[PDB]
Design a protein around this ligand. Sequence first.
Ligand code: CLA
Ligand code: CLA
Ligand code: CLA
Ligand SMILES: C=Cc1c(C)c2cc3nc(c4c5[nH]c(cc6nc(cc1[nH]2)C(C)=C6CC)c(C)c5C(=O)[C@@H]4C(=O)OC)[C@@H](CCC(=O)OC/C=C(\C)CCC[C@H](C)CCC[C@H](C)CCCC(C)C)[C@@H]3C
Ligand SMILES: CC(C)=CCC/C(C)=C/CC/C(C)=C/CC/C(C)=C/CC/C(C)=C/CC/C(C)=C/CC/C(C)=C/CC/C(C)=C/CC/C(C)=C/CC1=CC(=O)C(C)=C(C)C1=O
Ligand SMILES: CCCCCCCCCCCCCCCC(=O)OC[C@H](COP(=O)(O)OC[C@@H](O)CO)OC(=O)CCCCCCCCCCCCCCC
Ligand SMILES: CCCCCCCCCCCCCCCC(=O)OC[C@H](COP(=O)(O)OC[C@@H](O)CO)OC(=O)CCCCCCCCCCCCCCC
Ligand SMILES: CCCCCCCCCCCCCCCC(=O)OC[C@H](COP(=O)(O)OC[C@@H](O)CO)OC(=O)CCCCCCCCCCCCCCC
Ligand SMILES: CC1=C(/C=C/C(C)=C/C=C/C(C)=C/C=C/C=C(C)/C=C/C=C(C)/C=C/C2=C(C)CCCC2(C)C)C(C)(C)CCC1
Ligand SMILES: CC1=C(C)C(=O)C(CC[C@](C)(O)CCC[C@H](C)CCC[C@H](C)CCCC(C)C)=C(C)C1=O
Ligand SMILES: [Fe+2]
Lengths: 35, 31, 351, 35, 73, 309, 78, 44, 31, 34, 38
Amino acid sequence: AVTPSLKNFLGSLIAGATVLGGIALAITAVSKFDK
Amino acid sequence: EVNIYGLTATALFIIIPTSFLLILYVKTAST
Amino acid sequence: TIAIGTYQEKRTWFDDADDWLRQDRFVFVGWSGLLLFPCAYFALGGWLTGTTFVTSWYTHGLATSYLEGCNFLTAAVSTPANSMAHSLLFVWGPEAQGDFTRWCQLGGLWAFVALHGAFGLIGFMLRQFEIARSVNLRPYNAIAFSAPIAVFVSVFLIYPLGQSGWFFAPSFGVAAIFRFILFFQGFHNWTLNPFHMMGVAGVLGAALLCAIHGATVENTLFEDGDGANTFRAFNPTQAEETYSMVTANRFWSQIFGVAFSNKRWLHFFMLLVPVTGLWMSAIGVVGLALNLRAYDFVSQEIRAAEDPEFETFYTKNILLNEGIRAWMAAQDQPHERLVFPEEVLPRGNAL
Amino acid sequence: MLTLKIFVYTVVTFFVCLFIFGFLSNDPARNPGKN
Amino acid sequence: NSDFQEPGLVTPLGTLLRPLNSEAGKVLPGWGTTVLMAVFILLFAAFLLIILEIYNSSLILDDVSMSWETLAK
Amino acid sequence: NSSLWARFCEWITSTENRLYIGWFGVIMIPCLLTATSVFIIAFIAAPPVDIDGIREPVSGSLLYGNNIITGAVIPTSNAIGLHFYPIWEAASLDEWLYNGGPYQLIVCHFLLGVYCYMGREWELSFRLGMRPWIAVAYSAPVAAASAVFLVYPIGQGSFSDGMPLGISGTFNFMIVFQAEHNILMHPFHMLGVAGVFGGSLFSAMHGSLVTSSLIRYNIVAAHGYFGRLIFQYASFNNSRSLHFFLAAWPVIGIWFTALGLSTMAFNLNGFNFNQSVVDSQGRVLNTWADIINRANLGMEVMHERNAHN
Amino acid sequence: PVERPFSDILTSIRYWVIHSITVPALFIAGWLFVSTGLAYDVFGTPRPNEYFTEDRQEAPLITDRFNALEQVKKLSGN
Amino acid sequence: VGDVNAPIEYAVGAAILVSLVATAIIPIVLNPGQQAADKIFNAK
Amino acid sequence: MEALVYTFLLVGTLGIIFFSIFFRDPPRMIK
Amino acid sequence: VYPIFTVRWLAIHGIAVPTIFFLGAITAMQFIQR
Amino acid sequence: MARPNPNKQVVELNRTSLYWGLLLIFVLAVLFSSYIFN
Ligand code: CLA
Ligand code: CLA
Ligand code: CLA
Ligand SMILES: C=Cc1c(C)c2cc3nc(c4c5[nH]c(cc6nc(cc1[nH]2)C(C)=C6CC)c(C)c5C(=O)[C@@H]4C(=O)OC)[C@@H](CCC(=O)OC/C=C(\C)CCC[C@H](C)CCC[C@H](C)CCCC(C)C)[C@@H]3C
Ligand SMILES: CC(C)=CCC/C(C)=C/CC/C(C)=C/CC/C(C)=C/CC/C(C)=C/CC/C(C)=C/CC/C(C)=C/CC/C(C)=C/CC/C(C)=C/CC1=CC(=O)C(C)=C(C)C1=O
Ligand SMILES: CCCCCCCCCCCCCCCC(=O)OC[C@H](COP(=O)(O)OC[C@@H](O)CO)OC(=O)CCCCCCCCCCCCCCC
Ligand SMILES: CCCCCCCCCCCCCCCC(=O)OC[C@H](COP(=O)(O)OC[C@@H](O)CO)OC(=O)CCCCCCCCCCCCCCC
Ligand SMILES: CCCCCCCCCCCCCCCC(=O)OC[C@H](COP(=O)(O)OC[C@@H](O)CO)OC(=O)CCCCCCCCCCCCCCC
Ligand SMILES: CC1=C(/C=C/C(C)=C/C=C/C(C)=C/C=C/C=C(C)/C=C/C=C(C)/C=C/C2=C(C)CCCC2(C)C)C(C)(C)CCC1
Ligand SMILES: CC1=C(C)C(=O)C(CC[C@](C)(O)CCC[C@H](C)CCC[C@H](C)CCCC(C)C)=C(C)C1=O
Ligand SMILES: [Fe+2]
């Protein structure tokens, strides 16, 4: 069964993926604007 | 003769590096 | 055959990202910046927030915050309680369950700061490597920093990992660090361990070298300026050195007995001393983490126990350690629920 | 031990007199500079 | 030097194993297959995190008991 | 020029000797030689000494069951207090040993030797054309040693409070301060710790940059690295100011810590934050200072004998 | 594209117009944050009169890992 | 209990004094650094 | 036995110090 | 010279805003009767 | 027994290095002998 701790862990995985994607998008957009 | 192993350890640690360094110095000084 | 050189292909997103990151601005971001800046920023922010608002009432039974009326020397970010043995104390973890107030109360802020700070140190080392590669210099600053990172890793992660839990790691503060130092002096006899002796020698020798080199260089300058002050008689584009090596060499060969005759060797010795000292100290604390302490000198203990009329400073140090332990464990370790009656507390009156 | 006292006093006086008569024998003018 | 100072010794095993040590320095154009490596690295990191949390009691699973008592299965 | 005095002056003042002597040399040489001779002899084969003056001798010589770490030369007895106790003042050599005269002998001769070494540094610097400001740098360790070995006993009133010449003696010395005066919280000791740590940091980093720059540029190349590493552009762009800063930081730190120890000799104290936080109704909430104070209280209680037979 | 010198902004008018009305807002926000009592609620720091609960007259102790939330809620009296 | 004794009048009075003393000296400390960084940059 | 070992080690250290002071190779590299 | 919202702007503001907030908080804490 | 190896240098150790090594070993022995003997 999906224990609450496992649900929280999957949520943390999603949040980390979101943070990394945000950083990547920021660098990409800024580089494209400047070049 | 107390802690014979300790005495042997001290003697080896004082002799082996000293002999190695002295042999190296004599070998190189010939150049 | 189809040979190839370097960068003879079409440009890619990676090329644009690299070009933007490695620009010339007031702040050098670089690739290591992505890992360094966020982590260090959050570490500093967490420390300040913990020292300003959060308290340690429910972990150590103390009051450590400006909101509670503590000075800059007594405020600190206390470690989590001993019940939380080695949990990483995530906000979403089984302990906090997602409540920020309870997360702060239990003491996960310490783990937050410690982890993000360790990753910040890694990022800083990578930044030094990146700068050195960019400007084409050998990376010796990398090793010079590899020393303190090793010391930090040892003290703040390996020592608690061998003990009961995070409760015994340093708390980020001044009075907390003093408590830590006294705690080792009492329980481990950390002052008698050879590794701390070597570290002390290394640090003191580093200070000595700094002072002596500065004094010698500043007291052997060449006459290349009419003004009374020698600071303005120099520009960064000088060709020759600003001080006479021969005169300093003769002076220190006639005063002390042995003197340097090679700039590279001198500055490399400067680099070498402190790094070795701190590495040896780190190894010593690594050993202590497993309660592998140099405490006994069993022969002296046996001789002292045999007859009371034989006292050396070592026995007095042992007695002082006993006193420290007995009198401080009462409130230093609340989870043990220790209540020593005044009859049993060690005292010099009873020897 | 009076003899030891006498010997120590004599030695100390000799050395101190040597030092004093040393620094008084035109110290400042014996330097590598010329002025 | 000529052919790096004349040819070396020849042995049957050397001749047999020569093919495995011939194409030195060959490379593919572009980035090749770095994206697959990145995906695999991410999956490995996730697996390492999962095991680390399982062994640290930060991720309690129904089946695992996480104690010496599991030896009495 | 050919007078015996002239020949002696030329020999003492000559710079062709392997080790320069000078007049400060003629003073310091016998002092330091006597100090080291007596120190070695007492460290090897000295008998017990009653430091506390309660007929409880403390053994510190190697022959009496001791190592390098646990050996030392015990300071003089508490009965002598601050009196002057030369060898010819004691009734007999055995009593002189029992009371602890060689500590006084060593400390006096060594202090004179270090002061004359300070003087000889300037003397040789002047004989060569160098500038005379190395003695100022050397004053820091000399000041600290003079404080610890002479000023603290004067303030406390006895030489038994001096630092025993050993390792475990030094550790006991430090522990007794932390018990009595709370040195750790004194601002001057904080400045001393900062000076030592900053000196180590600057030595390591200066060595690293200089070694990296030196290629088969010394300051104009590494400055580009430093300005962008931790920001802080155009801070130490002059090669002379940098070395002056190096020479200045640790010396000032050690001066401040020595002055702090001297002030503690007259017993003001370190800081004291005991019971500085109280809630309503008057109850007391513990802070880290209270734990430090508990450790200090246990230390002090252990040290004092009180009941001495 | 040259990272205008700080001197240029120092003499600007819009810079001062913005900052002289913005910074005081932050300062007053902090003052009201720690004055209204929001800090105690947000960060869980007990008030001076909440240290010792009616039924408890000593420092608290968690002595529990997987039920630390309920333990802390009970000890704090909330 | 744990309320602030002082009123908001002093809050604003001190805000004015500690807000216009920090927004005008943060660019004066960095000016040397920004002036020297450009000299270091675009050179090597 | 321990005392003799300690004395020998200290004497050896002092002897190496003296030899370094008095029998060093001349520093002709830069002088 | 013209564009704003650069790296320097973000870097300075990030450490500037919380500093002012915390200074206000501490100044307010000063005037508590305990 | 096949061909002399071109990569063959010889180690060199000046006197200062020898003094440093002797000092290091003797100092370490001084520091550690008491602990070894207990
Ligand atoms: C580069 C910057 C950086 C770095 C290195 C870290 C690192 C860390 N943070 Mg910090 N953090 C950051 C930025 C950063 N953070 C930012 C920007 C914020 C604000 C949003 C935070 C807010 C924050 C909080 C509030 C907390 C942390 C915590 C942590 C620690 C736990 C890491 C973890 O499990 O997270 C998750 C990490 C990952 C998910 C790794 C990435 C792996 C990806 C997702 C793989 C995906 C592949 C695939 C889809 C997965 C398949 C499996 C499944 C889905 C089927 C760690 C030391 C926690 C901690 O330890 O505090 C005590 C904590 O409580 N951080
Ligand atoms: C003469 C007295 C003396 C001296 C010189 C030393 C010397 C030393 N001791 Mg000490 N010690 C002594 C007596 C002494 N000891 C006594 C009598 C005791 C009682 C037992 C102790 C107890 C003791 C303990 C318990 C410990 C030491 C440690 C050390 C070492 C410190 C290494 C270091 O700098 O780490 C400090 C540096 C770091 C941790 C690096 C962190 C740097 C980060 C990355 C910077 C962060 C950025 C920051 C926010 C920027 C702000 C800058 C701002 C401050 C300006 C060093 C060899 C420590 C050690 O090295 O053990 C391994 C240690 O744990 N000693
Ligand atoms: C991180 C931990 C730490 C650190 C880094 C320090 C650092 C320091 N402490 Mg503190 N201390 C600590 C923890 C710490 N302490 C704790 C926990 C305690 C309580 C247990 C103390 C208690 C304490 C006391 C009580 C004292 C210190 C002192 C000092 C200083 C010692 C170095 C000095 O000034 O000597 C300077 C150099 C000398 C004293 C040596 C002089 C050398 C002479 C002049 C020449 C000798 C010639 C030699 C014999 C011949 C050699 C020739 C050849 C063989 C090489 C330094 C600032 C001392 C201090 O401040 O000094 C005033 C002091 O008195 N500390
Ligand atoms: C008291 C000890 C001590 C401190 C505080 C210190 C501090 C520093 N040294 C640095 C550098 C160095 N240190 C070096 C050698 C040494 N440094 C030493 C000892 C120290 N060095 C010693 C003994 C050596 C000899 C080996 C070198 C060789 C370098 C450098 O190259 C570098 C430099 O250029 O400096 C000029 C800087 C690294 C910046 C940084 O953190 O990156 C950013 C990373 C951050 C901010 C993450 C850290 C987060 C920390 C771990 C969390 C806790 C933060 C709280 C504020 C803790 C407060 C604790 C309370 C008790 C106050 C920083 C100014
Ligand atoms: C009976 C008796 C004898 C009693 C003795 C009892 C007893 C206690 C014995 C002592 C025991 C003992 C030896 C203890 C110490 C043991 C110990 C802790 C060892 C640590 C060893 C160790 C490996 C530590 C690791 C760190 C380490 C390598 C430290 C090195 C320390 C060190 C040598 C520092 C340098 C010291 C020093 C004085 C340097 C000065 C250099 C110098 C002359 C530069 C001058 C100079 C400046 C210029 O600017 C220029 C230009 C020139 C040209 C120039 O020259
Ligand atoms: C996508 C996230 C966007 C930002 C969110 C706000 C960030 C600021 C958070 C401040 C603290 C407030 C409390 C939040 C905490 C909180 O409220 O969590 C709550 C949330 C859900 O828990 P529940 O409240 O549903 O649980 C209740 C019960 O069911 C528990 O048994 O937990 C998660 O799913 C993970 C959330 C992560 C949020 C942190 C984001 C960062 C993740 C780590 C990133 C690492 C990057 C590594 C790169 C290599
Ligand atoms: C009146 C004053 C009398 C002072 C007497 C004491 C002088 C001490 C002489 C130290 C010699 C150390 C060996 C150097 C061996 C040697 O030949 O070094 C020579 C070396 C200079 O070498 P070069 O610059 O020529 O080398 C260039 C390189 O590229 C290699 O060629 O000197 C130094 O680097 C500084 C040495 C300071 C090191 C100080 C160490 C102090 C240790 C003290 C141990 C005491 C133990 C006590 C036990 C009870
Ligand atoms: C089982 C078989 C046996 C195993 C053991 C074998 C051991 C072999 C020997 C290993 C050690 C060799 C050491 C060589 C020593 C040596 O000759 O070094 C010389 C070397 C510098 O060499 P250079 O770069 O000048 O070389 C230039 C070339 O021309 C060759 O000289 O210094 C170092 O790299 C660090 C040396 C150790 C650190 C020295 C300073 C710090 C320690 C001294 C502390 C004194 C006490 C101070 C506190 C009181
Ligand atoms: C919440 C949190 C977070 C974050 C945080 C942060 C990011 C923070 C920051 C913070 C900060 C960023 C802070 C700052 C602060 C500052 C301060 C607090 C300052 C102070 C200062 C002072 C106190 C000064 C003084 C002085 C001077 C210098 C001038 C005059 C003189 C005197 C000495 C008076 C997160 C979400 C991630 C997670 C969870 C937790
Ligand atoms: C020419 C030009 C320059 C010089 C410039 O700085 C910008 C702003 C980009 C950005 C907002 O800084 C993007 C910052 C986002 C960054 C990628 C996030 C990850 C890295 C760090 C967290 C950034 C903060 C570092 C700072 C604290 C030193 C633009 C748009 C331009 O056109
Ligand atoms: Fe230098």
